[PDB]
């Protein structure tokens, strides 16, 4: 969408990832599996709850005014009452429909941004030590055990630690 | 080949659809409805207190005491007044009720 | 009937669990806003794209 990740360069979702909104799938010698990214999921849940709260909290239930009754010599004020009732109804009906449409578009873009930001954080870390193979996936030029995988999911990944390894494998296929 | 780390997002068995400004009928994993569209089809008692049903009488017949409104004599408390559209008894003796509408609004409180 | 509720309308009784209702403009009691809309759904999750 607006950020090109969801239904973009990451074509589809992960039905097998049930414990979070965004995150990772890994595969190495120890094992594989989907794992939710806590930080992005936790913040996004707070944001959407705030967004829903900011729409409904001020929509407190109220006491509807009495339906007025008018006689045959009160058509003018009867029509004025009808104009008042119709005027308010049109505004709330039009605004509520339009507001939800606009909000829903931002909600999807918000999820799109969070995926893209999550992808960029990993890409900014690995650099030459991994190959971007599309669909939001990275192929390492070095062995990355379970401990190494969490460092990427942490913002801690040590590029020089695996640089000497990854450099040799990279230039091996480069030659 | 080499070890792989991917980035992806959630999917589930949700058939919930929302409309946006640029697209319509978008399927989303989670949503909240805001619109109530269901009623029980019965006139209930608000806050415990039962409503005052006028039967075959309008407010004029009830407040005046038309003999068809006989059952409406133990009136002590009510949440709201119910009038039927076909209530035709009211002022059996032909005449005009003065400020009838303002009386109805007065009795609404 | 013998039922309680907190919002009453000429054609029935409605729950006040949601901020909007489209059943009838005339209500008595603490009631949601009446609108002419047939659907008002706020998205909270992502676009649902299972195995394709």
């Amino acid at each position, epitope marked *: 969408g607006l950020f090109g990740a969801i239904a973009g360069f990451i074509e589809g979702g992960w039905t097998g990832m049930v414990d979070g909104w965004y995150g990772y799938h890994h595969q190495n010698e120890q094992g594989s599996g989907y794992a939710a990214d*806590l*930080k992005s999921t*936790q913040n996004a*849940i*707070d944001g*959407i*709850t*705030n967004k*829903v*709260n900011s729409v*409904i*909290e001020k*929509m*407190n*239930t109220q006491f509807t005014a009495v339906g007025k009754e008018f006689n045959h010599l009160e058509k003018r004020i009867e029509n004025l009452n009808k104009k008042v009732d119709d005027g308010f109804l049109d505004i709330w009906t039009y605004n509520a429909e339009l507001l939800v449409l606009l909000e829903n578009e931002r909600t999807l873009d918000y999820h799109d941004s969070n995926v893209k930001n999550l992808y960029e954080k990993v890409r900014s870390q690995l650099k030459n030590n991994a190959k971007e193979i599309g669909n939001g996936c990275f192929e390492f030029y070095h062995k990355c055990d379970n401990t190494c995988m969490e460092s990427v999911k942490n913002g801690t990944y040590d590029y020089p630690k695996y640089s000497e390894e990854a450099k040799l494998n990279r230039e091996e296929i480069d030659s | 080949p080499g070890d792989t780390l991917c980035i992806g997002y959630h999917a589930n068995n949700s058939t919930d659809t929302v409309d946006t400004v640029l697209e319509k009928n978008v399927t989303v994993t*989670h949503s*909240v409805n*805001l619109l109530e569209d269901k009623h029980n089809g019965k006139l209930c008692k608000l806050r415990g207190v039962a409503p005052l049903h006028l039967g075959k009488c309008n407010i004029a017949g009830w407040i005046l005491g038309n003999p068809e409104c006989e059952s409406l004599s133990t009136a002590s408390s009510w949440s709201y007044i119910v009038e039927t559209p076909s209530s035709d008894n009211g002022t059996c003796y032909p005449g005009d009720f003065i400020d009838y509408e303002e009386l109805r609004e007065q009795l609404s409180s | 009937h013998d039922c309680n509720t907190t919002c009453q309308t000429p054609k029935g009784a409605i*729950n*006040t*669990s*949601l*901020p909007f209702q489209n059943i009838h403009p005339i209500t008595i009691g603490k009631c949601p806003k009446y609108v002419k809309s047939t659907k008002l759904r706020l998205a*909270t*999750g992502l676009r649902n794209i299972p195995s394709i």
Partner: antibody, heavy 122, light 108 residues
Framework: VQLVQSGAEVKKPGSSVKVSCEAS????????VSWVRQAPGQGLEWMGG????????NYAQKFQGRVTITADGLTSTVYMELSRLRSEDTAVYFC????????????????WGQGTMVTVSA | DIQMTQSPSSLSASVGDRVTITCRAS??????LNWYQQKPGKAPSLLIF???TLQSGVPSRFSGSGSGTDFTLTISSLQPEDFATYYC?????????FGQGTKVEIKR
């Protein structure tokens, strides 16, 4: 805001108990709400929580299949229902909105209820 | 599951002296930790969240610190109002887990 819980209750073993937890001046809210019990003289114990924006409820494993945390639509009232009570279920039960001055805070119990004493005895 | 172990389970201190209560988790939980205070017969109240951020309405003498596995609730000066069991709780995953509790008592 102030969370107000239902009164203390006495129940015989094997029954079911439902506790309410309402907020003030809100009508409609989507804040997540957690329930925490405290056995006499012991520490706090997390039972579960509900996240209205996703429409699900998470529970601790020791209570799974026995407790349901529900909310009526988008209203602020949150109900906790425990089934098949025993003497070890006698405790003070707290509800807590997971919000701070920063807005909704999914993991921290910013505002607490007054508690609901439930005693199980036959 | 993550287990939180407070230490000491109980301590004694005078009025005005620095109080140092620790809290340790089974695994690394970054700064997803909160602190609570519970007077007897009274519901617990939040003091610190995100392991440093201070909830509105509680005094500045309460301070939070720590990132990773070990955390520290530091009371710079002790006052009579601050006499209750203090608990630490993690919000890194589910189910959420508390500590066993640390009671603070007047020294005599």
């Amino acid at each position: 805001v102030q969370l107000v819980q239902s009164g203390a209750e006495v129940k015989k073993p094997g029954s079911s108990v439902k506790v309410s937890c309402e907020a003030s001046g809100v009508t409609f809210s989507s804040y997540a709400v957690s329930w925490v019990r405290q056995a006499p003289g012991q520490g706090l114990e997390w039972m579960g929580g509900i996240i209205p924006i996703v429409g699900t409820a998470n529970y601790a494993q020791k209570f799974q299949g026995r407790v349901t945390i529900t909310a009526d639509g988008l209203t602020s009232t949150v109900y906790m229902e425990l089934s098949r009570l025993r003497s070890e279920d006698t405790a003070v039960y707290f509800c807590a909105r997971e919000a701070t001055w920063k807005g909704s805070s999914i993991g921290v119990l910013g505002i607490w209820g007054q508690g609901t004493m439930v005693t199980v005895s036959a | 599951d993550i287990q939180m172990t407070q230490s000491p389970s109980s301590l004694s201190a005078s009025v005005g002296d620095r109080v140092t209560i620790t809290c340790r988790a089974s695994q690394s939980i970054s700064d997803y930790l909160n602190w609570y205070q519970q007077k007897p017969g009274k519901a617990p109240s939040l003091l610190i969240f995100s392991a440093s951020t201070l909830q509105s309405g509680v005094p500045s003498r309460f301070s939070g610190s720590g990132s990773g596995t070990d955390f520290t609730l530091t009371i710079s000066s002790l006052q009579p109002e601050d006499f209750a069991t203090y608990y630490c709780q993690q919000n890194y995953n589910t189910p959420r887990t508390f500590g066993q509790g640390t009671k603070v008592e007047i020294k005599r």
